[PDB]
C-alpha cells in the first residue's frame with residue numbers, strides 16, 4: 275500500500291536501483307521484489323534539463339509517500355543535485371538521501387546520506403530500513419500539500435467549539451461547502467481543523483470518562499502541524515493541560531497557547547502578565563509558544579488567532595541557509611567558550627539543517643559527549659535569536 279519513488283538527475287543509477295527493488299507491474303506502478311522483507315509499491319517517474327527533472331520530482335511529490343533522492347557519489351555533489359534538492363524542499367513528504375556508486379552530502383539538507391551500490395547491492399538494507407521507518411506515519415486522510423492542518427485541544431467546556439465558531443464567522447473566512455474535519459479558507463489560504471466532530475461529540479453522547487477523549491485528542495495532534503492549547507482563564511491551569519501539551523511538544527508540533535474566557539476574569543493592570551508568567555512556570559517546555567488572550571463570547575482578539583496559527587506553521591516549516599547558520603553558530607561559540615572536560619574541549623566544525631516540521635539541525639563536533647544539555651540550549655537560543663522560530667520547537671543533534 276505504501277508508495278515509493280526514486281528521484282534524481284539522469285545517470286545517478288535510478289534505473290539500476292529501481293529494477294533491483296521492483297517486482298512485477300500492477301495494472302506505472304510496480305510491486306516490491308520478492309527478496310525484500312518489506313511490502314510496498316514503486317512508482318516509475320519516467321515522464322530541457324531543469325524542466326524534465328522538475329516534471330519527475332513533482333510526479334513523485336504527488337503520488338509517492340516516501341521519496342528516495344539519489345545522487346552520484348563518484349561525481350560528488352553537483353550543481354544539478356543542488357537543483358533537485360531545491361525542488362524537493364517543496365514537499366512535507368519524507369525524503370531519504372541515497373548516495374549511489376560508492377561531504378557536503380549533508381549540505382543537501384536531507385540529513386543522513388545512505389551509501390549504496392547498484393552492482394552488488396551494498397548499503398541497500400540500511401537505505402530500505404530508513405524508507406520503511408516512515409510507513410507507519412503515512413496519513414490515513416490525505417490533503418493537498420498546500421493545506422495547513424491544525425487542531426484545538428483543551429479540557430471539556432474551555433470553549434473549543436465556541437472559538438471555532440467565533441473564528442469561522444470572520445469576514446476573511448469562507449467555510450467550505452472525511453466528515454470529521456472542517457475545511458475553510460482564510461485570506462483564500464486553505465486550512466483544515468482536524469476532528470471537529472470530536473468537539474461536537476457532546477449533545478449526541480454523554481461523556482462518562484475523559485480517557486477516550488484524551489486519546490482521541492492525541493490522534494488529532496498526530497494529524498496536525500499546529501496545535502492550539504486552549505486554557506480556561508477563569509479556572510486556571512490543570513494537570514491534564516500539561517500532559518497533552520507535553521505530548522504535542524514531544525511530537526515536534528508547532529504550538530500556540532490560547533487563554534479563552536478573558537471576558538470573565540476580574541482584571542487589574544497586571545492580571546494578564548501574572549497569567550502569562552503562571553503559564554511559563556507551568557509549561558516550562560513551551561517557551562517558544564506565543565500566548566494569546568481572547569474571548570469567544572465577546573469576540574475580543576478572536577482575530578489574532580488565525581494569524582498566530584499561520585506564523586507558527588511558517589516557522590515550523592522554515593528552512594535556513596547553511597552559510598548563515600554556520601555564521602550564527604560561530605558567533606555563539608565566539609561569545610561563549612565551549613564546555614571542557616578534564617582537558618578536552620568541545621569543538622564545533624560544521625552545522626546544517628536536516629529536516630523541517632520541526633526544524634532540526636545537526637552539529638558536527640569533536641565528540642558528542644562534550645556537548646552538554648546547557649550548551650545545547652544556549653545554541654538553540656542563539657539560533658532562535660537569529661532566525662525567529664516563534665511557535666515551534668527546534669531539535670539539535672551533535673554528531674562526530
Ligand SMILES: Nc1nc2c(ncn2[C@@H]2O[C@H](COP(=O)(O)OP(=O)(O)O)[C@@H](O)[C@H]2O)c(=O)[nH]1
Pocket residue numbers: 283284285286287288289290291374375376390391392393
Ligand atoms: N560503478 C557503478 N555504476 C553504476 C551503479 N549503478 C548504476 N551504474 C551505471 O551508471 C549508469 C546510469 O545508470 P541508470 O540506472 O540508467 O541511471 P539513471 O540514468 O539515473 O536511471 C549506467 O551505465 C549504469 O550501469 C553502481 O552502483 N556503480
Ligand SMILES: Nc1nc2c(ncn2[C@@H]2O[C@H](COP(=O)(O)OP(=O)(O)O)[C@@H](O)[C@H]2O)c(=O)[nH]1
Pocket residue numbers: 428429430431432433434435436437473534535536537538568569570571572
Ligand atoms: N464567559 C465566557 N464563556 C465562554 C467563552 N467561550 C465559551 N464559553 C462558554 O463555556 C461553555 C463551554 O463552551 P464550549 O464551546 O462547549 O466548550 P468546549 O467543551 O471546549 O467545546 C459554553 O457554555 C460557552 O458558552 C468565553 O470566551 N467567555
